[PDB]
Amino acid sequence: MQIFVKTLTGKTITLEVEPSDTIENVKAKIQDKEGIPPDQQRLIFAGKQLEDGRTLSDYNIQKESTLHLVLRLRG
Amino acid sequence: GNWCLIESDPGIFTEMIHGFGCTGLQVEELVVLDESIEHLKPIHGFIFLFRWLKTDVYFSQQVIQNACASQALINLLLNCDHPDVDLGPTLKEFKDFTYDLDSASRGLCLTNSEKIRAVHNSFGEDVFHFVTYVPVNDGVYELDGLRAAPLRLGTVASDGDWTEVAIKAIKEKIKNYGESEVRFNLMAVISDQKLKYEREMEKFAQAGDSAEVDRLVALIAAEDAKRERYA
Ligand SMILES: *NCCCC(=O)OC
């Protein structure tokens, strides 16, 4: 299925996932589409921070739910 | 080289503030730029992180590059003027001593503080930079530690929300990067929400309102769980 990842800037990144996919897997997917490593990523689904090895279906995340990406960058 | 880099994480920044000896604040991460934060008021400042593309306002300029996280945060705190907020002895003594020093000399003094260097390092080629936004009297200022002076972005009030000016400046800064650049982070420095709920809870307790006390317990528990996930 497809789900949407929104960013601070307003951009919307679309992903090919299945409800079985781990959060960590979704982060791997954001890398190849964007360039940002998993390290620098936190995913929020209204409105908890999501745990790396704990599945979309686990968080009740559907076909075309929208998630939010925030960045952990070393300044 | 003797200062580590610091991750753009609202939990780390909340702890750095406390580490510097300042009480009454916390840091909240912003997730969208249209996020209404009316409920987070007062907002004491913003901390903004982006990729570096190479008299009433307190401001220090950096003389070391890797200090930018602590320096941006301190530039924000030393412009805070609020009953909610106590800077603590370390930061008050720093501000008093450096009151008539030029901006780069302030950076030097900050850099030589052992307490500040200690706190900073206890939390740690594209370069990512932190800058601060803060209101002072009727102006709104961007405090970029690479510049020699604060940058006035605009004027505010009477009705005014100062945050509109800052957010406008930040959006327009984002419009300078590839429409595909997404590596930014925005945090707001706000009053301690747990402390706010505990004050209200003790008042409703005194008023005999069990229902409101329980709901405040729920808010507090929610706040604690959120703080724990940031750990
Ligand atoms: N994030 C560490 C410091 C970088 C900075 O000062 O960029 C100019």
Side-chain angles (χ1 to χ4, degrees):
Chain A
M1 47 170 182
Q2 279 197 340
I3 95 282
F4 291 170
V5 183
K6 316 274 278 80
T7 66
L8 175 61
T9 61
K11 206 205 186 65
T12 307
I13 305 164
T14 78
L15 300 170
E16 242 314 279
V17 299
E18 303 299 337
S20 71
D21 265 329
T22 56
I23 304 298
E24 176 175 4
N25 277 141
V26 192
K27 279 173 184 161
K29 293 193 190 299
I30 294 191
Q31 184 164 28
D32 293 316
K33 188 72 79 77
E34 279 293 334
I36 308 166
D39 259 342
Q40 299 171 8
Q41 298 185 31
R42 302 288 187 277
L43 287 170
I44 294 165
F45 178 56
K48 188 201 167 165
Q49 232 196 34
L50 281 21
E51 311 204 26
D52 276 351
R54 249 230 175 281
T55 267
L56 294 172
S57 80
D58 211 88
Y59 288 105
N60 202 268
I61 288 167
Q62 307 294 83
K63 166 77 166 312
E64 298 173 17
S65 303
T66 156
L67 280 59
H68 293 259
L69 171 64
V70 296
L71 273 295
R72 293 292 172 267
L73 295 162
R74 302 188 84 215
Chain B
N2 183 13
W3 290 65
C4 65
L5 304 174
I6 298 294
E7 199 174 73
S8 59
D9 177 317
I12 285 190
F13 279 78
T14 297
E15 294 180 38
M16 288 174 59
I17 294 180
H18 285 139
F20 293 148
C22 170
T23 47
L25 303 163
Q26 74 186 70
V27 183
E28 167 81 358
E29 184 156 32
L30 265 69
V31 181
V32 305
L33 295 157
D34 73 79
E35 185 171 328
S36 295
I37 31 144
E38 168 79 35
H39 64 302
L40 292 188
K41 295 204 183 308
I43 312 275
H44 308 269
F46 289 109
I47 302 155
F48 180 57
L49 167 138
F50 54 89
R51 181 161 56 93
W52 182 19
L53 306 174
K54 299 147 159 176
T55 116
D56 209 280
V57 180
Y58 187 94
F59 172 78
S60 56
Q61 182 175 19
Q62 293 168 236
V63 296
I64 121 132
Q65 184 174 302
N66 289 359
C68 75
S70 284
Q71 190 138 5
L73 178 58
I74 286 159
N75 276 339
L76 182 158
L77 299 174
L78 299 194
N79 284 292
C80 287
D81 184 11
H82 203 279
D84 285 351
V85 193
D86 169 46
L87 293 179
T90 298
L91 292 176
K92 287 162 167 180
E93 281 163 14
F94 183 84
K95 189 180 182 176
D96 292 330
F97 174 75
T98 65
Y99 199 80
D100 199 32
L101 270 171
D102 63 87
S103 64
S105 301
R106 289 164 168 177
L108 172 62
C109 297
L110 187 156
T111 291
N112 282 350
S113 180
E114 241 324 310
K115 163 90 158 181
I116 288 180
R117 186 211 250 95
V119 172
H120 179 95
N121 277 337
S122 74
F123 290 104
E125 243 288 296
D126 283 335
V127 174
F128 288 94
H129 187 28
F130 286 101
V131 304
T132 267
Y133 299 83
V134 74
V136 179
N137 300 328
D138 58 18
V140 178
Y141 297 82
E142 180 182 346
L143 311 180
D144 182 330
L146 292 191
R147 302 191 150 86
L151 164 64
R152 200 175 198 270
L153 303 168
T155 307
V156 86
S158 300
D159 312 335
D161 188 342
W162 81 264
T163 68
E164 308 260 9
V165 181
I167 292 174
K168 199 163 311 188
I170 286 158
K171 290 181 160 161
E172 277 282 300
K173 183 199 292 287
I174 292 157
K175 286 288 98 200
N176 215 332
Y177 291 81
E179 290 128 310
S180 79
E181 176 67 79
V182 305
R183 294 159 304 169
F184 303 91
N185 181 281
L186 181 58
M187 296 178 282
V189 180
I190 62 189
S191 299
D192 190 317
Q193 296 303 294
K194 182 174 184 173
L195 198 44
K196 186 178 65 177
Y197 299 150
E198 293 175 321
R199 258 100 173 238
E200 301 185 340
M201 173 173 152
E202 201 51 43
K203 290 179 176 297
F204 285 102
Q206 291 169 17
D209 188 339
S210 249
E212 195 71 357
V213 171
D214 286 333
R215 172 233 230 174
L216 285 159
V217 168
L219 249 8
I220 290 171
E223 180 63 30
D224 285 340
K226 176 177 171 171
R227 292 175 177 194
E228 194 197 11
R229 290 189 293 269
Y230 286 114

